[PDB]
Amino acid sequence: SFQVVECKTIDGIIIRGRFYAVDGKGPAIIMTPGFNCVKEMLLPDIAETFQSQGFNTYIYDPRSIGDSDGSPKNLIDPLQQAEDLADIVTHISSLPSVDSSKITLWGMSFGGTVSACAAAVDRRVKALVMVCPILSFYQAEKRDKAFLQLIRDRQSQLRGNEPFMLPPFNSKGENPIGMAGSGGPGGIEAYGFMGAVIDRGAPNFRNKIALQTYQKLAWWQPKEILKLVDKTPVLMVTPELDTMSPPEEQKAAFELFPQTKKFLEAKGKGHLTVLSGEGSVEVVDAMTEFIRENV
Amino acid sequence: SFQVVECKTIDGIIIRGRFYAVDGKGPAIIMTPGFNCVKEMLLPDIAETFQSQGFNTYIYDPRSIGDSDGSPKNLIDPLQQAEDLADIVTHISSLPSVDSSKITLWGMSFGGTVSACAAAVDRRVKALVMVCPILSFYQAEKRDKAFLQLIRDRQSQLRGNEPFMLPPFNSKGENPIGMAGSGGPGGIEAYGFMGAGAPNFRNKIALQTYQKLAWWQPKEILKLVDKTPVLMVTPELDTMSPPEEQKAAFELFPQTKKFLEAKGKGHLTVLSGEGSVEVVDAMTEFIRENVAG
């Protein structure tokens, strides 16, 4: 059982999401979805487990995505999502059933890297959990053409046209900047899930992003921001066969963390299946174990 | 005589500045001022020399600064300033006297680093001039305190209050993050500079500026500038941006480049006084040589 809980940002935007409350006053986990994904995809299964084990759990749609406010639509600014998490933490910490001293930031894929950026600046975050985080986006060979495409979109917007939209992965599993396994098995699998005409419980999901998302991704240096995360206990869950975010890149980032940390590799899992199938129950139990051990 | 020229951004914000036109059609230099500085500080003298040598020149107040649109006021987002430059390049390139194939980005201090970020993405920028670029902002000892103050400003705003404002340099020359020589000679010189014809100059910034500086990693973005001819002018005695940091970034550039160290000059005096004429002529010569259409 969950209730709809809305969080206001400092610029007046409403973040909308699901809040799985627990009885009494207990800790809270705030879950951020992956790139352009909505709260209804996969995460409600994890939240019910978190809730049954005594954790208030909040899954939300990030700015301009799903049920949440934000214009232009599906313009993914990771630094803005990280800042919004500070405002989300504020509202969730004020809820009656929430112990504000026991806040954990949980993120999957893109949302895991966004969560770490928020934890670097917000000491209210007592624990960080990153599932298959993505730390790079541009293929060097496609940079110049993607840049030119971004500029021409700006000029097109200055002439009155709408911001150019496109799927994060086309039918060939590709995208202009080559992110997240574009041109390989991972991008093809990503398109298969995002483009499927299936009821996933998320009417407001949209398999399109604004092209200017790639402009924000060009500024973002997440590997440098994660170096600021030097106090928050961090748990990283990496799929062994991640074809969208190279496991070695995730492992290189985990190496730099000097504080209390824990690494878990999900054998035989990919970017999208790391929290599903056999072994997924043991992985989720390890997440709550790590939080309680550090909360 | 200069004319007021406005540049619309993709989100509808109006950027305002001075345009120094030349007869006929010719190259254009877009000058970005330093941290929270207005177009009337120092730069008009440089633009008149550029104009007399055949260069259209556009000095502008960045977003939320001076005469330009932008809210909240004096919130310095360098990444947004970099994106705004793409729109500024678009409007300046459309002007009758401007050769759209001969656009040069020019920046001083903070504005020099912002110009490099815009040059990394826009191939219309045919040359880059960076004057005393600043490439780091946080002192490690002040990081956690500044981060906590930023979160508390967010909680204050969420209760309905205006964003917390403060001078970028106090009377001791300090600021919460330790940027631009805070606590030493650099900060005191910047405090005196900010403290004494721009009606909309405001000696204050939003605290949330420091949140934007925390995300910024310009040393990594400067690595993307691998094609644009770049001239860097570094003061030998820069007390606000370490010369070693400026030189280290310059040495990484693989393309056509030139480095000039202004002997005995500081962050704010690099383009003033003795030897400043030769530095400006070195800029015009680098631009004529590298941006020929």
Ligand SMILES: COC(=O)CCSC(=O)C[C@@H](O)/C=C/CCC[C@@H](C)O
């Ligand atoms: C069998 O389980 C599944 O297929 C669920 C697939 S959606 C999911 O994992 C929830 C979402 O937060 C994570 C998305 C990662 C893909 C987007 C990535 C490019 O950032």
Ligand SMILES: [Cl-]
């Ligand atoms: Cl929709």
Ligand SMILES: [Cl-]
């Ligand atoms: Cl032209």
Ligand SMILES: [Cl-]
């Ligand atoms: Cl020719």
